[PDB]
RNA sequence: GUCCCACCCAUACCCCGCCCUCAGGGUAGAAACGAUGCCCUGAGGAGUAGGCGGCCGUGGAGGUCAGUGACGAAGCCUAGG
RNA sequence: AGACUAAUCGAACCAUCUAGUAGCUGGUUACCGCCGAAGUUUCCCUCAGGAUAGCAGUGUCGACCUUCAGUUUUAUGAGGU
RNA sequence: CCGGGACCGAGGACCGCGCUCUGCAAGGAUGCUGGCGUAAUGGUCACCAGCGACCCGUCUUGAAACACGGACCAAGGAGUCAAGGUUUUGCGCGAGUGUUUGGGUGUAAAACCCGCACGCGUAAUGAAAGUGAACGUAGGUGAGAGCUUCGGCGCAUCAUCGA
RNA sequence: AGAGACCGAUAGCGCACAAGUAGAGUGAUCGAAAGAUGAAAAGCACUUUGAAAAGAGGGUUAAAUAGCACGUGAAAUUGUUGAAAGGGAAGCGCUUGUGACCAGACUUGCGCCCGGCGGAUCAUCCGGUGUUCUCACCGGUGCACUCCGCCGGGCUCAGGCCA
């Protein structure tokens, strides 16, 4: 089942807004961190260097937070929790949490067979 | 009076055991509560009169609510199960929900709710097996 | 560029009331309900008044609305959005007719033992939906004992914050002029 | 409650709000009331006038029970008699009973006189009274006696 | 060890605040969406013969 | 040194799409609504010292998911999403 | 010779008062959004510092009062570059 | 009035202003056709290439500085608490308000009940002995939201003359 | 003796261990570091190389990726294997290219006509029960150009990527 008809995604950006100066220390991890010194380059927005994070960045409030083939995400936990999803076959789509037995695994794929729900990480 | 259905919404709009609150939407978990979203048109369990849809062993079975028996909960629920064909069930949910003015503004969600139970409740199709690609067609080899 | 003096200017008002009291949000959307499909100005006023806090709607008392109860006033309608008390002074209390937010409860008897009525606002709503034959009331603003203090100063007659009242505080230079000067 | 409080997002500014030419140190300018005189004469003399000098004599051993009189005006009198046996006496039912009011039982020792009063003729019983006070009571109807 | 631990409140407001909530003990809405199990229940205040 | 044609490019000016902030409106004899929602219209976006608002993480306590787990919880590695 | 008194002497070594005081150096830990300065007046055994006024933020209230203006015109005064 | 080229296609039943008026270029793109249905479009990483790019933190009018600290990694690491004030926000009662020094009781450091005194407020001013708040429907004048039988009555607050 | 919205081996007393111990000073005094195999030692018999320490086979155990340097075993730092670059630094930003690796999506759905198969049972009426009092459920009758499920053939519409 294919979802919903939906205008184009647009992303505006891929790249991931490294912190300045993490390529050459090994104790700085590389989550972004606003650089707040009185002679930053980066600060003083010079050219040829790093970009800061915007509110100009975001995207289409239309298109947020759907992956690539058009749904959103939803985590569910055992069956009781896909059965959530009986009205949104278009919109939704469900993903098995990581700390769940092999057992209860197979026995989530086969009801959401049935609902005609779309399962992301399904084992092959 | 002081209860009503307004006041028991505005307890209950932020937190109630029925919730669940996650990134990108909000669910509901309740018996009455059709296509389980957390709304005031949607909350059954507040509303004086709401319906509900419950998958039985063969076909569907309908349930709603007895306006006048509201303190006594042993017996405050109408319940009728349809499972002779879709069409005949169709009729018979849109002509209780939308004919004598009870909740005539559910009368599209109920019909599509019968629509999902019974279109799950069918035999299943195979599936076809996957394809490998550039990348196992080597290891195939 | 555009050389603007002002941009992005908040406004300066209450839009919403800052409490969260669930018989309070009725109210409010009872009367934005009003006010947006009516002409009479009595509501949009009545909306404003119901978002103030509690320094903004001083208390008012029975001898202040029995004061505008003269000169052909005698069958209006008072409103008060605020709550309303008794005066142990009024010795004598004419008949009225109230609608008021919450009274207290000698008020509330000494009201209805003269003959009149107390209501609510909803049921004023439901009886003038449009303010008829109704007079608006406040109490008195300035009547805090911390207003007192406001803009202290020399030449300004206020009142100063001291730990206690007697001969030995603040009284010996600047105020008499027996001892170097006067304020 | 310290999780919402200005101190958690100061986290990650140097100098934590105070300033990088002032440094917040330990006491710039003296610790409690020091320099009235000097260098916080300014201060003391926008606010607080008053504060320094001498007035008025000393009085050694001061006992302050010799000095209690609490008062009570002479519109609030009426507030002294039960509502029930008020209400009878303002409609008038009675027409030929007084109440003698006694005030120091009730915890007052002065009777000033600031508001009006109904035609009612009363019996007050006071350690001081007033002169205005004294007129209001006799013109009503009653009188006012001394009790010690 | 001479932080504020206990906290002091108005009588007035202990009592009207255990009233409320004998109030909504009434109200068959409100046990179910706090997650009690009383689809069964015949009537919502319960009141045995008191002989038992 | 003076005059005349064409041409080249800024985060500036014009048009269009998208994000946020601010402002102004509509929405119940309710076939009704996370009314803190939705829909329509217009303008604006630089910033140290400093002020305020909204959100994200950690160790514990009360309530609730009749939550997950020796058919593998927590932790750790991973130019795999 | 201010020399020596356990590698210590123009006043030994050990514990406590003691976390002794500092107008002086050094540091002060996640993200986004909106607004956005001063080195100037007066006083202080004041001159590497404070109080006071100014510049700035937030919270509002009275009306939507229709008033206002780092500007021009017309009429009429003062000045000693 | 006729050609030639480039970038874009937001919105999602009708409702409107119109015209050349069996319809339309009028409140935002439709119609016909071809190849492929997988590594082909797309994404991550490594490297070469064109242009750009001085080391962070700090004091300072001025820092990449021939100004100071920093060989590297892991864990620890800095506006807190109490008493007393003050303004603002939410709540209860209201001319009153505050049970918990103490007593009764208890499923026991919890929860529930009780009252005499006491604190703050209800009255100020003088160094003190002392005295102690209405001529008027609790005043007159100019403005004032709102109401109104259309004549007027006028809350809060501002200015002013009085008691 | 009883407890905690306390700390959890750089924390909590200086001390969770043969801790006021080892150690320093002539002396008054100063004063640490250091917890965890496995359920049970079942703590590796025997052969073989070596002077020995030990190695290789072979054993015990669910596991020796638990072997008395013993739970889990990160970073700085080092070795082997595989890939790549290098004419007086390297790292980095915007945009293509080559090479390696890879997530998605599509692989049909609905509707109509004809033929075949199988079934209980469509409209209507009668009795009972419930309910929003006019809308439904159960039992019986209803028996093939009605209803339902499947298969075969034909037809319309829609559906992925680049142009």
């Given at each position: 089942?294919?979802?919903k ?47 800061m ?25 055992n ?10 076959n ?5 993903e ?20 005609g ?8 | 009076?002081?209860?009503?259905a ?13 919730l ?8 509901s ?7 389980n ?25 309908v349930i ?6 509201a ?10 199960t349809y499972?002779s ?18 909740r ?15 279109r ?5 199709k ?16 | ?28 959307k ?39 109860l ?8 008072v ?10 002074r ?9 609608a ?33 034959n ?35 505080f ?14 | ?52 000098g ?8 001061l ?10 005006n ?19 039912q ?8 006694d ?16 035609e ?9 009274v ?19 | ?7 002091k ?11 409320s ?29 008191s002989?038992?």
């Open positions: 089942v294919a979802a008809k939906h205008v184009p995604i647009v992303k505006k950006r891929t790249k991931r807004f490294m912190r300045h100066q993490s390529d050459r220390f090994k104790c700085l991890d590389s989550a972004w961190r606003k650089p707040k010194g009185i002679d930053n380059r980066v600060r003083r927005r010079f050219k040829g260097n790093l970009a994070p915007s509110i100009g960045y975001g995207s289409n409030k239309k298109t947020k937070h759907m992956m690539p083939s058009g749904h959103k995400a939803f985590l569910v936990h069956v009781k929790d896909v059965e959530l999803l009986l009205m949104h278009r919109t939704y789509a469900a098995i949490a990581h700390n769940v037995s092999s057992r209860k695994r197979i026995d989530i794929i086969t009801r959401a067979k049935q609902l729900v779309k399962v992301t990480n399904a084992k092959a | 009076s002081n209860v009503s307004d006041l028991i919404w505005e307890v209950s709009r932020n937190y109630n055991s029925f669940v609150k996650q990134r990108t939407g909000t669910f978990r309740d018996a009455l509560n059709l296509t979203q957390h709304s005031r048109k949607h909350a059954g369990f507040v509303n004086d009169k709401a319906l509900g849809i419950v998958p039985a062993e063969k076909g569907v079975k709603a609510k007895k306006v006048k028996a303190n006594k909960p042993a017996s405050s629920l109408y319940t009728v499972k064909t879709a069409r005949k069930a169709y009729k018979a949910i849109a002509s209780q929900a939308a004919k004598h003015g009870y005539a503004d559910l009368r599209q969600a109920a019909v599509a709710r019968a629509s999902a139970i019974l799950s409740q069918r035999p299943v195979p599936e076809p097996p996957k394809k490998l690609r550039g990348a196992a067609a080597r290891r195939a080899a | 560029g555009i050389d603007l003096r002002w941009k992005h200017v908040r406004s300066s008002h209450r839009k919403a009331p800052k409490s969260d009291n669930v018989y309070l949000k009725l109210l409010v009872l009367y934005r309900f009003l006010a947006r499909r009516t002409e009479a100005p009595f509501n949009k006023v009545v909306l404003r008044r119901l978002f103030m806090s509690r320094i903004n709607r001083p208390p008012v008392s029975l001898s202040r609305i029995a004061r505008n003269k000169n052909g006033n005698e069958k209006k309608t409103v008060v959005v605020a709550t309303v008390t008794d005066d142990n009024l010795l004598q209390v004419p008949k009225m007719e109230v008021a937010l919450r009274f207290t409860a000698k008020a509330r008897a000494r009201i209805e033992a003269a003959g009149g009525r107390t209501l609510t606002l909803d049921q004023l709503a439901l009886e003038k939906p449009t303010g008829a109704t007079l608006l009331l406040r109490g008195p603003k300035n009547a805090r004992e911390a207003v007192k203090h406001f803009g202290f100063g020399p030449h300004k007659h206020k009142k100063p914050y001291v730990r206690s009242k007697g001969r030995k603040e009284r010996a230079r600047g105020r008499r002029r027996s001892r170097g000067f006067k304020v | 409650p310290t999780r919402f409080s200005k101190t958690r997002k100061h986290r990650g500014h140097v100098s934590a709000g105070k300033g990088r030419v002032g440094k917040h140190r330990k006491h710039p300018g003296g610790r409690g009331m020091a320099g009235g005189q000097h260098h916080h004469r300014t201060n003391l003399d926008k606010y607080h006038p008053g504060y320094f001498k007035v008025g004599m000393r009085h050694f051993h006992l302050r029970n010799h000095y209690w009189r609490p008062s009570i002479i519109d609030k009198l009426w507030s002294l008699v039960p509502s029930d046996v008020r209400e009878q006496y303002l409609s008038g009675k027409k030929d009973t007084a109440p003698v009011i005030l120091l039982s009730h915890g007052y020792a002065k009777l000033l006189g600031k508001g009006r009063l109904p009612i003729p009363v019996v007050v019983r006071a350690r001081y007033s002169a205005e006070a004294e007129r209001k009571v006799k013109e009503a109807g009653g009188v006012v006696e001394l009790v010690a | 060890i001479w932080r504020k631990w206990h906290v409140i108005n009588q007035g407001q202990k009592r009207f605040a255990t009233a909530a004998l109030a909504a003990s009434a109200v068959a809405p409100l046990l179910m969406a706090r997650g009690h199990q009383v689809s069964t229940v015949p009537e919502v205040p319960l009141v045995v013969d002989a038992a």
